[PDB]
Amino acid sequence: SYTLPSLPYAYDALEPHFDKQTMEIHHTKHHQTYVNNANAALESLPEFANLPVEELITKLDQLPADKKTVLRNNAGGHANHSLFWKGLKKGTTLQGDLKAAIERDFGSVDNFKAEFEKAAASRFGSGWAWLVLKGDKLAVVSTANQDSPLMGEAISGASGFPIMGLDVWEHAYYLKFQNRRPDYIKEFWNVVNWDEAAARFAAKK
Amino acid sequence: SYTLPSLPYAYDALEPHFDKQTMEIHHTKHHQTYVNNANAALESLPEFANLPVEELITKLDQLPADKKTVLRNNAGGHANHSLFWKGLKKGTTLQGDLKAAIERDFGSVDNFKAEFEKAAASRFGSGWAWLVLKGDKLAVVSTANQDSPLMGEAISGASGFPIMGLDVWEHAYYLKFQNRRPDYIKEFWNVVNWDEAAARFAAKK
Ligand SMILES: [Fe+3]
Ligand SMILES: [Fe+3]
Ligand SMILES: [O-]
Numbered sequence: 497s498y499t500l501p502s503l504p505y506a507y508d509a510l511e512p513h514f515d516k517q518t519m520e521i522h523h524t525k526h527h528q529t530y531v532n533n534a535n536a537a538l539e540s541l542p543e544f545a546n547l548p549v550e551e552l553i554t555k556l557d558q559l560p561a562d563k564k565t566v567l568r569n570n571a572g573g574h575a576n577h578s579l580f581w582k583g584l585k586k587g588t589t590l591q592g593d594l595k596a597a598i599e600r601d602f603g604s605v606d607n608f609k610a611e612f613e614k615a616a617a618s619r620f621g622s623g624w625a626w627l628v629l630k631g632d633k634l635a636v637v638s639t640a641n642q643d644s645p646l647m648g649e650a651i652s653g654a655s656g657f658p659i660m661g662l663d664v665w666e667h668a669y670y671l672k673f674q675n676r677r678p679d680y681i682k683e684f685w686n687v688v689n690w691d692e693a694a695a696r697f698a699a700k701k
Numbered sequence: 702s703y704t705l706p707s708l709p710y711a712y713d714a715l716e717p718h719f720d721k722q723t724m725e726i727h728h729t730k731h732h733q734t735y736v737n738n739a740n741a742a743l744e745s746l747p748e749f750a751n752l753p754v755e756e757l758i759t760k761l762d763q764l765p766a767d768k769k770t771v772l773r774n775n776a777g778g779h780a781n782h783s784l785f786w787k788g789l790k791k792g793t794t795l796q797g798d799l800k801a802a803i804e805r806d807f808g809s810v811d812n813f814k815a816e817f818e819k820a821a822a823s824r825f826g827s828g829w830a831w832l833v834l835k836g837d838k839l840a841v842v843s844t845a846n847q848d849s850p851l852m853g854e855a856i857s858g859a860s861g862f863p864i865m866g867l868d869v870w871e872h873a874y875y876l877k878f879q880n881r882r883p884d885y886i887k888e889f890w891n892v893v894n895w896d897e898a899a900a901r902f903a904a905k906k
């Protein structure tokens with residue numbers, strides 16, 4: 497069964513960028529719920545239950561028809577937020593191979609950020625914006641609700657190994673930014689953990 | 702050209718059920734934005750810009766994929782919220798023809814409320830919960846993002862004429878309820894304008 501992962505920090509660690517009140521609720525309420533609903537659905541699926549959530553979401557089509565939707569939403573939700581927590585930290589600097597790779601595939605860090613911001617801002621409704629690695633090339637893609645590029649094109653409309661990502665569901669930014677999602681996206685640049693992204697990139701490049 | 706309609710009441714007229722701060726932000730920011738993005742899209746579509754928003758959304762299939770998407774989301778947003786504002790009011794009582802029709806298609810008002818609450822709660826991500834009239838039968842359905850049953854089955858995955866509806870995007874309840882969407886849904890019963898719902902049921906158009 498899945499468990500709510502402990503965070504790499506206290507809820508107020510991303511202040512004054514991401515509000516601690518949201519961090520706590522996002523963690524203990526929203527993320528906990530994805531874990532509970534996922535476990536409920538996995539109760540009658542012993543073989544699928546052993547898999548780490550990241551591997552499960554890559555096999556949604558092998559699940560019984562009546563299990564696909566509930567797990568797609570909740571396993572996706574568990575996997576996305578687990579990655580999200582580790583993908584946040586103050587004081588990091590984009591550098592090394594990840595910086596060079598971005599400049600290589602996007603032309604420059606600026607083209608990258610502008611493209612990411614647009615993807616993040618144009619995602620209508622609930623969803624995520626991602627920086628993924630497709631084989632040997634990085635790209636910016638977005639998914640609806642709790643879908644993940646790890647689920648593949650057929651299901652999520654996107655694909656690739658997620659290096660980093662931004663949650664754009666309104667619950668991730670409403671208490672502090674309300675409708676102003678663009679300001680929330682700007683703040684994200686102050687808390688995206690480039691060291692973790694660099695770590696994931698070194699493992700997959 | 703569409704315009705942001707004025708509310709039938711003050712921002713605090715729905716309290717202590719729906720908070721005034723949300724009422725204002727939801728109206729002057731969210732709805733206002735759908736109106737603006739919708740007009741920008743219709744600015745290069747004269748043959749369509751003169752149609753009432755409710756009618757435009759039934760003809761989305763007559764638009765190129767690009768305009769279709771932007772209008773589906775924003776014309777839909779404009780139509781749904783214009784209906785929402787008029788569909789809210791305190792001190793009304795479910796009665797007469799509409800109440801008899803509900804008990805008839807659902808068994809009783811409580812059975813109806815329970816089915817509506819389930820539909821509203823189960824709508825994963827952003828979307829709406831509706832009470833629609835399909836021919837001569839009432840039904841409960843939900844749509845994603847700003848989709849409307851007026852768009853037809855193929856586009857929204859639902860159909861029928863909207864009688865009443867509840868917006869379950871998180872921006873509609875996060876400031877006061879945060880993650881507790883169910884408490885928000887329960888409060889809805891105190892502000893749903895049954896007089897206007899009864900009027901729409903009588904007109905059937
Ligand atoms: Fe989230
Ligand atoms: Fe809304
Ligand atoms: O989310």
Ligand SMILES: [O-]
Nearest residue numbers: 731732782870
């Ligand atoms: O809205």
Ligand SMILES: [O-]
Nearest residue numbers: 846868869870
């Ligand atoms: O909405």
